[PDB]
Amino acid sequence: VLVQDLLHPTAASEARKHKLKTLVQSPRSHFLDVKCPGCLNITTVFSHAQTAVTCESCSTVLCTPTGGKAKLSEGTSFRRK
Amino acid sequence: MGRMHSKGKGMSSSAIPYSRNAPAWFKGSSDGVVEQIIKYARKGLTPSQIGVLLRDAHGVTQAKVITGNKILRILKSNGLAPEIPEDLYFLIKKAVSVRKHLERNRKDKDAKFRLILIESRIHRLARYYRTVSVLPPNWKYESATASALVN
Amino acid sequence: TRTSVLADALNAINNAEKTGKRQVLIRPSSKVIIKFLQVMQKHGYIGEFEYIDDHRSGKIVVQLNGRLNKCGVISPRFNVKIADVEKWTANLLPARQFGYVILTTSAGIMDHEEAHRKHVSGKILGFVY
Amino acid sequence: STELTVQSERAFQKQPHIFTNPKAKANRKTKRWYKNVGLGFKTPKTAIEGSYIDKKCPFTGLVSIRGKILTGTVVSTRMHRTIVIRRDYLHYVPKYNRYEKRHKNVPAHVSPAFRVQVGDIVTVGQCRPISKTVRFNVLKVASATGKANKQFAKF
Amino acid sequence: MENDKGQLVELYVPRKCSATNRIIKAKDHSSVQINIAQVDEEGRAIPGEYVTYALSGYIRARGEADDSLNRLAQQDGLLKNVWSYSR
Amino acid sequence: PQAKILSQAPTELELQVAQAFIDLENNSPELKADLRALQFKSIREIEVAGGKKALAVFVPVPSLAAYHKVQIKLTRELEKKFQDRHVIFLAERRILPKPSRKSRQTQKRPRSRTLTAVHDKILEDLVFPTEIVGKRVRYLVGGNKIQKILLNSKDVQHIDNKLESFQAVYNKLTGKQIVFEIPS
RNA sequence: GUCCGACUUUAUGUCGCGCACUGGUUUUCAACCGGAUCUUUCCUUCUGGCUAACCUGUACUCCUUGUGGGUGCAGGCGAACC
Ligand SMILES: [Zn+2]
């Protein structure tokens, strides 16, 4: 109060403000690199995808929709992009 | 948070990041993305559906950031844009659903309320798309041209 | 629907200044706001402010130095003659000694004395004192 | 306009005191006197080679343009061989320091040498008293379409 | 302020709030004045020589005078790492 | 093969830079198959305070995409050969002014042909290997504009000392002064 | 420079309002109004005057080598005006 560096605020402060109230509109979604149990066809998967995605090479559900981020199909493995 | 047809005041939306250029990690190039887009369009898929599929099944964040241009305009480039934008089309379809409900049963006077609200939305979009030279001005809308076009 | 962007900007400025906030956040951040603020600073009524880009209209962060007592817009940009400006003076400026009704003319956004010594009159924007 | 063989009504249409010579070994159809009004106006092409009469044409007719010049918007084309132009402008009522968008509609005369659609933007000029409604007369249509010069989408 | 001759006719040039850069009332019996005694290198009192901070009671009313005092104390090089420019 | 890669030949400095590019063309097996379609557009030097200099090559913005594709190795080799020199790969611009009310409508100017467009793009490609993350500007009490620029902390090590050269080149480009800042 | 009030019938050195009336403005000063301009910077430009004018260039010279100074006549600045 009565002074802030709202041009240079604490990073955790933006981190704890959700979307559109940051200095720059900074989405929190990201990507993941995902390995399917069946085939080694490495793929990229959106954080908050909607469609029940199956691998393009072979049909096997990988991620399942929710209100928020879509659940993985519990079978695959992931790493940060 | 305008929200004509209710008292809604929700700003729930999606905020684009800062980079209008493609992200560093991405490997595909614009032309291949365009060919994927046009093949998807020839499947008979509405542009918003194809945008969602590009975002999910691939690292296609923005059509414009990757291929330098947006989906509808590209689909116009190859002479394959549908006659009606997906927005007005889906609204007309929902209006047809409402109409079939009200013809099936009568006492849904509150459904008459929804009907007038929706058809007001159609009137708004009709004025807009007449001004901006998308539809020819000759186009009107009562009940049955919807039945022919949608069905 | 944000109608007059500079109106909202100065309204926030005045609100915080009354509250005492040494700084203000302005959402729309248009050219008119910017030029109003260089007039603001050149007269000495405000400190150093900053512009943020968004690829959408940016943002404004103005540092309050307390010297301001009020901003204020005249949202109907009433059409003013060269002689009439003085009356606006006696109706908005706290005294004839100082105080600056800001008006936009073909030359640009200026203080009223700037316009008078240029002998040019345009349309009215607001006031500072 | 006069619609497809001007020589239609119960009387002939001839630009007065111009003699179509049958004694000339020429077979030149007719002598169509023509003239430029001036003021930086260009007489349109279709007027020189036309066949119509339009005694009230500024170019091929008898009327002489002089006085006021105005700009307006076509509002009604139904009337035969004439036109009505709406003029929308602002009026400063002094009590409130405000302007006022009101309209005044004025009839003018169109030569067949012009093609007019509703909503076109036209320069009009002053002339002799032509009719109790018409005291002005068109010169030329700048905005021939407004936005409709391109209508197809075939890339 | 000044006369035509060039004399300061005005009585009472006012004080200005060291916190919010604002004038101080004469009747508003809430203005606060803080005397900060200078301390020598060796740990003694230095009476007579000491700095002053005149803070308007407005901050005593809104309730943020604490941050103001911390601000002025840290900035003036008398106090260490209590106040932050970015919170 | 100099005469084909400059299009007009005054100012021998440009031809010696072309000679250095040809020397780059010497190492074929990987530094070729792309370097054939490279050209110069009246290269100009840029002075820098302190003694250093910053080279400014210009591109007809045709396949500048291929340049930025194979850029970094060319950049470093040009630095190694032209010692004490910092080359900047500008996009040469034929920028257009605004239509004045007095001036006659002259085929309405696309915004790509605007001062803002050229200046923003030239900043965006001034430090190519890393994207600028943000733009700021301040307006001093004296009445002078200062644009502040925020570049990614990630991928900064590829320049790490040429910010002064960037300030110099762009200030002499337009007079709009520049001071960078890096987030943590 | 012109000079004005202290000094009284008349006048000056001297003290003073540090110019009461007029300039150079590089006295650094500050402006603030334009104007030319280099901006990748248009302020519409031609078709002809008339060429205003001097990159002109012809004799090169009235002349102290020296651009201190100009009559002159096809290219060629028009913007000085038609
Ligand atoms: Zn698979």
Automatic annotation (TrEMBL), chain A:
Cofactor: Zn(2+)
GO biological process terms on file: maturation of SSU-rRNA from tricistronic rRNA transcript (SSU-rRNA, 5.8S rRNA, LSU-rRNA); ribosomal small subunit assembly; translation
Residues at which Zn(2+) 3 binds: C39, C55, S57, C58
Record PROSITE patterns: RIBOSOMAL_S27E
Protein name as catalogued: 40S ribosomal protein S27
Note on how the cofactor is bound: Binds 1 zinc ion per subunit.
Record-stated family: Belongs to the eukaryotic ribosomal protein eS27 family.
PANTHER family: 40S RIBOSOMAL PROTEIN S27
Gene Ontology terms, MF aspect: structural constituent of ribosome; zinc ion binding
UniProt keyword list: Metal-binding, Ribonucleoprotein, Ribosomal protein, Zinc, Zinc-finger
Keyword Zinc-finger: yes
Phylogenetic lineage: Eukaryota, Fungi, Dikarya, Ascomycota, Saccharomycotina
Positions of Zn(2+) 6 binding: C58
Binding residues annotated for Zn(2+) 2, in chain numbering: C36, C58, T60
InterPro entries: Ribosomal_eS27 (IPR000592), Ribosomal_eS27_Zn-bd_dom_sf (IPR023407), Ribosomal_zn-bd (IPR011332)
Gene3D superfamilies: Zn-binding ribosomal proteins
GO cellular component, one term: cytosolic small ribosomal subunit
Binding residues for Zn(2+) 4: C55, C58
Pfam families given in the database record: Ribosomal_S27e
Residues given in the record as Zn(2+) 7 binding sites: T60
Residues binding Zn(2+) 5: E56, S57
Binding residue positions for Zn(2+) 1: C36, C58
Automatic annotation (TrEMBL), chain B:
Domain Small ribosomal subunit protein uS15 N-terminal: 1-60
Key words, A-Z: Ribonucleoprotein, Ribosomal protein
GO cellular component: cytosolic small ribosomal subunit; nucleolus
GO process annotations (BP): translation
A Pfam family hit: Ribosomal_S15
SMART domains: Ribosomal_S13_N, Ribosomal_S15
CDD domains listed in its UniProt record: Ribosomal_S15p_S13e
SUPFAM superfamilies assigned: S15/NS1 RNA-binding domain (SSF47060)
Any one GO molecular-function label of the UniProt entry: small ribosomal subunit rRNA binding
InterPro entries: Ribosomal_uS15 (IPR000589), Ribosomal_uS15_arc_euk (IPR023029), Ribosomal_uS15_N (IPR012606), uS15_NS1_RNA-bd_sf (IPR009068)
Family: Belongs to the universal ribosomal protein uS15 family.
Stated name of the protein: KLLA0F18040p
Organism name: Kluyveromyces lactis (strain ATCC 8585 / CBS 2359 / DSM 70799 / NBRC 1267 / NRRL Y-1140 / WM37) (Yeast)
TrEMBL record, chain D:
GO molecular function list: rRNA binding; structural constituent of ribosome
SUPFAM superfamilies: Nucleic acid-binding proteins (SSF50249)
Residues of the Small ribosomal subunit protein uS17 N-terminal domain: 7-70
Record has Cell wall biogenesis/degradation as a keyword: no
GO biological process terms on file: maturation of SSU-rRNA from tricistronic rRNA transcript (SSU-rRNA, 5.8S rRNA, LSU-rRNA); ribosomal small subunit assembly; translation
GO cellular component terms, semicolon-separated: cytosolic small ribosomal subunit
InterPro entries, alphabetized: NA-bd_OB-fold (IPR012340), Ribosomal_uS17 (IPR000266), Ribosomal_uS17_arc/euk (IPR028333), Ribosomal_uS17_CS (IPR019979), Ribosomal_uS17_N (IPR032440)
Keywords: Ribonucleoprotein, Ribosomal protein, RNA-binding, rRNA-binding
Keyword Cell inner membrane set for record: no
Entry similarity comment: Belongs to the universal ribosomal protein uS17 family.
PANTHER family, per database record: 40S RIBOSOMAL PROTEIN S11 FAMILY MEMBER (PTHR10744), 40S RIBOSOMAL PROTEIN S11-RELATED (PTHR10744:SF9)
Record protein name field: RP41
Phylogenetic classification of the source organism: Eukaryota, Fungi, Dikarya, Ascomycota, Saccharomycotina
From TrEMBL, chain F:
Keywords: Ribonucleoprotein, Ribosomal protein
Gene Ontology molecular-function annotations: structural constituent of ribosome
Lineage: superkingdom: Eukaryota
Gene Ontology annotations for the cellular component aspect, listed alphabetically: 90S preribosome; cytosolic small ribosomal subunit; small-subunit processome
An example Gene Ontology biological process: rRNA processing
Similarity comment: family membership: Belongs to the eukaryotic ribosomal protein eS7 family.
Record-linked PANTHER family: 40S RIBOSOMAL PROTEIN S7, SMALL RIBOSOMAL SUBUNIT PROTEIN ES7
Protein name: 40S ribosomal protein S7
Organism per entry: Kluyveromyces lactis (strain ATCC 8585 / CBS 2359 / DSM 70799 / NBRC 1267 / NRRL Y-1140 / WM37) (Yeast)
